[PDB]
Design an enzyme around this catalytic site. Structure first.
Site, PDB file in Angstrom:
ATOM      1  N   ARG A   1       0.809  -1.214   0.000  1.00 41.56           N
ATOM      2  CA  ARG A   1       0.000   0.000   0.000  1.00 41.56           C
ATOM      3  C   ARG A   1       0.844   1.266   0.000  1.00 41.56           C
ATOM      4  O   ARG A   1       0.309   2.352  -0.246  1.00 41.56           O
ATOM      5  CB  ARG A   1      -0.946   0.005   1.203  1.00 41.56           C
ATOM      6  CG  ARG A   1      -2.391  -0.292   0.836  1.00 41.56           C
ATOM      7  CD  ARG A   1      -3.188  -0.727   2.046  1.00 41.56           C
ATOM      8  NE  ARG A   1      -4.615  -0.849   1.758  1.00 41.56           N
ATOM      9  CZ  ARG A   1      -5.183  -1.916   1.201  1.00 41.56           C
ATOM     10  NH1 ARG A   1      -4.451  -2.968   0.863  1.00 41.56           N
ATOM     11  NH2 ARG A   1      -6.490  -1.928   0.980  1.00 41.56           N
TER      12      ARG A   1
ATOM     13  N   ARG B   1     -11.595  -7.822   0.830  1.00 41.97           N
ATOM     14  CA  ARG B   1     -12.833  -7.950   0.072  1.00 41.97           C
ATOM     15  C   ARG B   1     -13.562  -9.241   0.420  1.00 41.97           C
ATOM     16  O   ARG B   1     -14.797  -9.266   0.494  1.00 41.97           O
ATOM     17  CB  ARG B   1     -12.532  -7.888  -1.426  1.00 41.97           C
ATOM     18  CG  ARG B   1     -13.761  -7.936  -2.320  1.00 41.97           C
ATOM     19  CD  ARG B   1     -13.367  -8.046  -3.784  1.00 41.97           C
ATOM     20  NE  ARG B   1     -14.508  -8.365  -4.638  1.00 41.97           N
ATOM     21  CZ  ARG B   1     -14.409  -8.786  -5.895  1.00 41.97           C
ATOM     22  NH1 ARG B   1     -13.217  -8.942  -6.458  1.00 41.97           N
ATOM     23  NH2 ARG B   1     -15.504  -9.052  -6.593  1.00 41.97           N
TER      24      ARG B   1
ATOM     25  N   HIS C   1      -9.433 -19.234 -17.062  1.00 39.39           N
ATOM     26  CA  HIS C   1     -10.350 -18.773 -16.036  1.00 39.39           C
ATOM     27  C   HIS C   1     -11.786 -18.930 -16.523  1.00 39.39           C
ATOM     28  O   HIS C   1     -12.067 -18.693 -17.702  1.00 39.39           O
ATOM     29  CB  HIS C   1     -10.085 -17.306 -15.645  1.00 39.39           C
ATOM     30  CG  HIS C   1     -10.272 -16.325 -16.760  1.00 39.39           C
ATOM     31  ND1 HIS C   1     -11.509 -16.009 -17.278  1.00 39.39           N
ATOM     32  CD2 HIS C   1      -9.375 -15.574 -17.443  1.00 39.39           C
ATOM     33  CE1 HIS C   1     -11.366 -15.113 -18.238  1.00 39.39           C
ATOM     34  NE2 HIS C   1     -10.080 -14.833 -18.359  1.00 39.39           N
TER      35      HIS C   1
ATOM     36  N   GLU D   1     -21.292 -21.053 -14.365  1.00 39.75           N
ATOM     37  CA  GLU D   1     -21.035 -20.538 -15.703  1.00 39.75           C
ATOM     38  C   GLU D   1     -22.128 -20.962 -16.677  1.00 39.75           C
ATOM     39  O   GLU D   1     -22.475 -20.210 -17.596  1.00 39.75           O
ATOM     40  CB  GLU D   1     -19.668 -21.009 -16.195  1.00 39.75           C
ATOM     41  CG  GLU D   1     -18.495 -20.348 -15.488  1.00 39.75           C
ATOM     42  CD  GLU D   1     -18.387 -18.867 -15.797  1.00 39.75           C
ATOM     43  OE1 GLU D   1     -19.068 -18.403 -16.735  1.00 39.75           O
ATOM     44  OE2 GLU D   1     -17.623 -18.167 -15.100  1.00 39.75           O
TER      45      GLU D   1
ATOM     46  N   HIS E   1     -24.893 -18.454 -17.083  1.00 41.35           N
ATOM     47  CA  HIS E   1     -24.679 -17.368 -18.032  1.00 41.35           C
ATOM     48  C   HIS E   1     -25.081 -17.783 -19.442  1.00 41.35           C
ATOM     49  O   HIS E   1     -25.687 -16.999 -20.182  1.00 41.35           O
ATOM     50  CB  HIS E   1     -23.214 -16.929 -18.002  1.00 41.35           C
ATOM     51  CG  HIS E   1     -22.774 -16.387 -16.679  1.00 41.35           C
ATOM     52  ND1 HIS E   1     -23.652 -16.128 -15.649  1.00 41.35           N
ATOM     53  CD2 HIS E   1     -21.544 -16.056 -16.217  1.00 41.35           C
ATOM     54  CE1 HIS E   1     -22.982 -15.661 -14.610  1.00 41.35           C
ATOM     55  NE2 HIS E   1     -21.703 -15.607 -14.929  1.00 41.35           N
TER      56      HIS E   1
ATOM     57  N   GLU F   1     -24.967 -11.603 -13.460  1.00 42.17           N
ATOM     58  CA  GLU F   1     -24.206 -12.448 -12.551  1.00 42.17           C
ATOM     59  C   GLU F   1     -25.051 -13.014 -11.417  1.00 42.17           C
ATOM     60  O   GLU F   1     -24.576 -13.895 -10.695  1.00 42.17           O
ATOM     61  CB  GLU F   1     -23.029 -11.662 -11.968  1.00 42.17           C
ATOM     62  CG  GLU F   1     -21.943 -11.327 -12.980  1.00 42.17           C
ATOM     63  CD  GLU F   1     -21.174 -12.552 -13.437  1.00 42.17           C
ATOM     64  OE1 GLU F   1     -21.377 -13.638 -12.853  1.00 42.17           O
ATOM     65  OE2 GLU F   1     -20.365 -12.427 -14.383  1.00 42.17           O
TER      66      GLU F   1
ATOM     67  N   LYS G   1     -13.286   3.526   6.750  1.00 39.82           N
ATOM     68  CA  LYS G   1     -12.930   2.129   6.975  1.00 39.82           C
ATOM     69  C   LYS G   1     -13.262   1.674   8.390  1.00 39.82           C
ATOM     70  O   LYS G   1     -13.424   0.469   8.619  1.00 39.82           O
ATOM     71  CB  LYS G   1     -11.440   1.915   6.702  1.00 39.82           C
ATOM     72  CG  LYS G   1     -11.120   1.549   5.262  1.00 39.82           C
ATOM     73  CD  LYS G   1     -11.108   0.042   5.059  1.00 39.82           C
ATOM     74  CE  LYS G   1     -10.592  -0.329   3.679  1.00 39.82           C
ATOM     75  NZ  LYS G   1     -10.352  -1.792   3.545  1.00 39.82           N
TER      76      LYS G   1
ATOM     77  N   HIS H   1     -10.000  -3.304  -9.030  1.00 40.71           N
ATOM     78  CA  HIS H   1     -11.131  -2.631  -9.655  1.00 40.71           C
ATOM     79  C   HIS H   1     -10.987  -1.115  -9.649  1.00 40.71           C
ATOM     80  O   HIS H   1     -11.611  -0.444 -10.477  1.00 40.71           O
ATOM     81  CB  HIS H   1     -12.429  -3.033  -8.953  1.00 40.71           C
ATOM     82  CG  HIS H   1     -12.692  -4.506  -8.971  1.00 40.71           C
ATOM     83  ND1 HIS H   1     -11.928  -5.407  -8.259  1.00 40.71           N
ATOM     84  CD2 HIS H   1     -13.632  -5.237  -9.615  1.00 40.71           C
ATOM     85  CE1 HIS H   1     -12.387  -6.628  -8.464  1.00 40.71           C
ATOM     86  NE2 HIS H   1     -13.421  -6.553  -9.281  1.00 40.71           N
TER      87      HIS H   1
ATOM     88  N   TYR I   1     -21.417  -5.555  -7.394  1.00 39.95           N
ATOM     89  CA  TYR I   1     -21.318  -6.713  -6.513  1.00 39.95           C
ATOM     90  C   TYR I   1     -22.370  -6.665  -5.410  1.00 39.95           C
ATOM     91  O   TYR I   1     -22.951  -7.696  -5.059  1.00 39.95           O
ATOM     92  CB  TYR I   1     -19.912  -6.797  -5.921  1.00 39.95           C
ATOM     93  CG  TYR I   1     -18.834  -6.976  -6.965  1.00 39.95           C
ATOM     94  CD1 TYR I   1     -18.734  -8.158  -7.690  1.00 39.95           C
ATOM     95  CD2 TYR I   1     -17.920  -5.966  -7.231  1.00 39.95           C
ATOM     96  CE1 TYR I   1     -17.754  -8.328  -8.648  1.00 39.95           C
ATOM     97  CE2 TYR I   1     -16.936  -6.127  -8.188  1.00 39.95           C
ATOM     98  CZ  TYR I   1     -16.857  -7.309  -8.894  1.00 39.95           C
ATOM     99  OH  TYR I   1     -15.878  -7.475  -9.846  1.00 39.95           O
TER     100      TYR I   1
HETATM  101 ZN   LIG Z   1     -16.928 -15.066 -13.518  1.00 40.22          ZN
END
Ligand SMILES: [Zn+2]
Ligand SMILES: *[C@@H]1O[C@H](CO)[C@@H](O)[C@H](O)[C@H]1NC(C)=O
Ligand SMILES: *[C@@H]1O[C@H](CO)[C@@H](O)[C@H](O)[C@H]1NC(C)=O
EC number: 3.4.17.23
Lengths: 98, 592
Positions: B146, B250, B322, B352, B355, B379, B458, B482, B492
């Protein structure tokens, strides 16, 4: 074809719909808007005939399908196309239906 | 002679050309991914450039049709989905400067290293921050990362923020946040109309309802970590940022070994049971197809079994490897993944496949509307499938778990806690990060108080404290993937909420009596036809109507989320009795 069979064409735009059993092979630009096209393509002047991107990777709804149509005509004119017919006995010494 | 028919014909031609150009570009991308070479990469880049040029030219030619005259809703929506320019609004100079700064930040993040050993982000830093349990072994890496990446991206990020704000202002918007908050903007009738500014008031409201559960989970995690970290955790304080199992925090899934409700009854893994029967990748995909057909959805394409790259290629091809679900168009759907016999991959195959099932739903809508309702819906349809296929009841039906097994309470609590550490703990972090990014893009946080307000938030939302002081010279927000690479992060939160919304809405219609997390939509044709009612619309209707079609509500709903972890909620409420649930926002590990 893997690269793409762009030889099969199809018309997408037209002034008005066709009539029963009518064919159009003209390649004039579709005069969509009031701006009179001058043989060039662009805004409101699109080509009517597009091409198919036939490829093997396509699914089952976009792959090439051959379609034939047999239309029968029965005008007052004498019939000249008659379907088949036959059997096979030359029976003798016995009365039968001939 | 009216502009409506002219726009209709223009959109028809645009879609006719797009369903070809986008298909070519996606096929080039798939070919590049299959065998990663320098020739296929060039072909992919050229196809993408051609597609982008065509799209931007059509958009430039499309902005000459104001939406005021378009009467038909579908035509107006098609024209609006294309009129948006985006980055092309800026000047050539400004666009090139923004591209340079973006690629500079991306390169600085991808080639980042922290040494006093001398490792990189993925090889050493991730594994160390994930498995290591020593205080300094993690603190030194966290601080070095950081302080290097943050301090190297601060000056570039400062100008990138202003460039993005100018870009947004050039597109009739106010800030880059408002530009990112435009995906959830709906249009329609009086009830199916949503505004961008209305999201800011909802995301917060949806967070106030989850605060008790998150506070209980945080208190339990702190009490469980006190053992491994005796002299580094306070009984009524926050948790250090380097003791969250991840570089940023995260996902708290890496804290499961230290935070286990009942260790003597581990979680259920069917990998060995899957290997004993002689399963393989194709068998897993066939099982997923059977599950997806049981709910009453269309059958997979014949090409999905021939042209798809379901297993790792043994011909020496180097793949990205991936999980991805590609929808090339014209009836071409494939899945790219190095599928194996493990359980996580077994569930990802079903995730998957969702999708692909979605892409196979809205295929009837115009190309300009072949996409999910919002970024949080696409998603959300796949994750709910894994929630239904990863239950103790489904594994017994397929034959992975013998019949003599019976569901236990302690192992159920363990699974609930393991799922909450990844689903319930990831919502506050994303919410705080998005709040900070919005307040920054809006210029509400002066450029001389970035890190100060970041670390102050935070402690109030995520309840995390820094192990060492970080003044305005650092940039921790930029250290995240991101944030450095231009990408939205609010999707998300909406995804996590909508997955539970859909789970409950589809399980209540299947007349299931039991815990919400033990649902099984298999052998229920009514659970699929009601779901397809929304998957077939995509972007043809506002996301409010698409949501109401499934759940009935026309906005976010968090009550179903709290009902998913209700047993674990009571367990934590009863186990966290001998402590104070919360955290005081003055404790500091760096101060004495
Ligand atoms: Zn994915
Ligand atoms: C791998 O890449 C080469 C080009 O370098 C290509 O000729 C070959 O066909 C590829 N392998 C595949 C896609 O099977
Ligand atoms: C679904 O019904 C069939 C036929 O009764 C049965 O064999 C199968 O095990 C059932 N599956 C589930 C999910 O209960």
């Amino acid at each position: 074809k893997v690269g793409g069979n762009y030889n099969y064409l199809y018309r997408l735009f037209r002034k008005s719909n066709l009539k029963p059993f009518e064919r159009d092979i003209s390649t004039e630009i579709y005069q969509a808007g009031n701006k009179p096209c001058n043989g060039v393509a662009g805004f409101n002047c699109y080509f009517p005939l597009r091409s198919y991107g036939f490829r093997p990777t396509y699914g089952v709804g976009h792959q090439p399908y051959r379609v034939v149509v047999l239309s029968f005509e029965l005008l007052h004119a004498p019939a000249t196309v008659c379907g088949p017919k036959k059997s096979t006995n030359l029976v003798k010494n016995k009365c039968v239906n001939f | 002679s009216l502009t409506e028919e002219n726009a209709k014909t223009f959109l028809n031609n645009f879609n006719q050309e797009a369903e070809d150009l986008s298909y070519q570009s996606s096929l080039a991308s798939w070919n590049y991914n299959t065998n990663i070479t320098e020739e296929n990469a060039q072909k992919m880049s050229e196809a993408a450039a051609k597609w982008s040029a065509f799209y931007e030219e059509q958009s430039k030619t499309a902005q000459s049709f104001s939406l005021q005259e378009i009467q038909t809703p579908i035509i107006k929506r098609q024209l609006q989905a294309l009129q948006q320019s985006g980055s092309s609004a800026l000047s050539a100079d400004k666009n090139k400067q923004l591209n340079t700064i973006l690629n500079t930040m991306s390169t600085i993040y991808s080639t980042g290293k922290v040494c006093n050993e001398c490792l990189l982000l993925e090889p050493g830093l991730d594994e160390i921050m994930a498995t290591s349990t020593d205080y300094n072994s993690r603190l030194w890496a966290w601080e070095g990362w950081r302080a290097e990446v943050g301090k190297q991206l601060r000056p570039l990020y400062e100008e990138y923020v202003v460039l993005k704000n100018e870009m947004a202002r050039a597109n009739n918007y106010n800030d880059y946040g408002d530009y990112w908050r435009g995906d959830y903007e709906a249009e329609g009738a009086d009830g199916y109309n949503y505004n961008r500014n209305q999201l800011i008031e909802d995301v917060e409201r949806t967070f106030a309802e989850i605060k008790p559960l998150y506070e209980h989970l945080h208190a339990y995690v702190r009490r469980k970590l006190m053992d491994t970290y005796p002299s580094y955790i306070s009984p009524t304080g926050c948790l250090p940022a380097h003791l969250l199992g991840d570089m940023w925090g995260r996902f708290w899934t890496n804290l499961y070994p230290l935070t286990v409700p009942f260790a003597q009854k581990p979680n259920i893994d069917v990998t060995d049971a899957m290997m004993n029967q002689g399963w393989d990748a194709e068998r897993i995909f066939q099982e997923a197809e059977k599950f997806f057909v049981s709910v009453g959805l269309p059958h997979m394409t014949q090409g999905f079994w021939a042209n798809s790259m379901l297993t790792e290629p043994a011909d020496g091809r180097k793949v990205v490897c991936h999980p991805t679900a590609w929808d090339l168009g014209h009836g071409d759907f494939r899945i790219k993944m190095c599928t194996k016999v493990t359980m996580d991959n077994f569930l990802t195959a079903h995730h998957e496949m969702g999708h692909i099932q979605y892409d196979m739903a809205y295929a009837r809508q115009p190309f300009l509307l072949r996409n999910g309702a919002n970024e949080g819906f696409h998603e959300a349809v796949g994750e709910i499938m894994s929630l239904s296929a990863a239950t103790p009841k489904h594994l017994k039906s397929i034959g992975l778990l013998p019949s003599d097994f019976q569901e236990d309470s302690e192992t159920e609590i363990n699974f609930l806690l393991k799922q909450a550490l990844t689903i319930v703990g990831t919502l506050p972090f994303t919410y705080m990060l998005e709040k900070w990014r919005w307040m920054v893009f809006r210029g509400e946080i002066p450029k001389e108080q970035w890190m100060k307000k970041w670390w102050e938030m935070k402690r109030e939302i995520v309840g995390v404290v820094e192990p060492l002081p970080h003044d305005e010279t650092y940039c921790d927000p930029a250290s995240l993937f991101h944030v450095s690479n231009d990408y939205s992060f609010i999707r998300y939160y909406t995804r996590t909420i909508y997955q539970f919304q859909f789970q409950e809405a589809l399980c209540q219609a299947a007349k299931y009596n039991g815990s919400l997390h033990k649902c099984d939509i298999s052998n229920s044709t009514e659970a699929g036809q009601k779901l397809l009612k929304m998957l077939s619309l995509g972007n043809s209707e506002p996301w409010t109507k698409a949501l109401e079609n499934v759940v009935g509500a026309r906005n976010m709903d968090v009550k179903p989320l709290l009902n998913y972890f209700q047993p674990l909620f009571d367990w934590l409420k009863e186990q966290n009795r001998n402590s104070f649930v919360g955290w005081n926002t003055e404790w500091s590990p760096y101060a004495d």
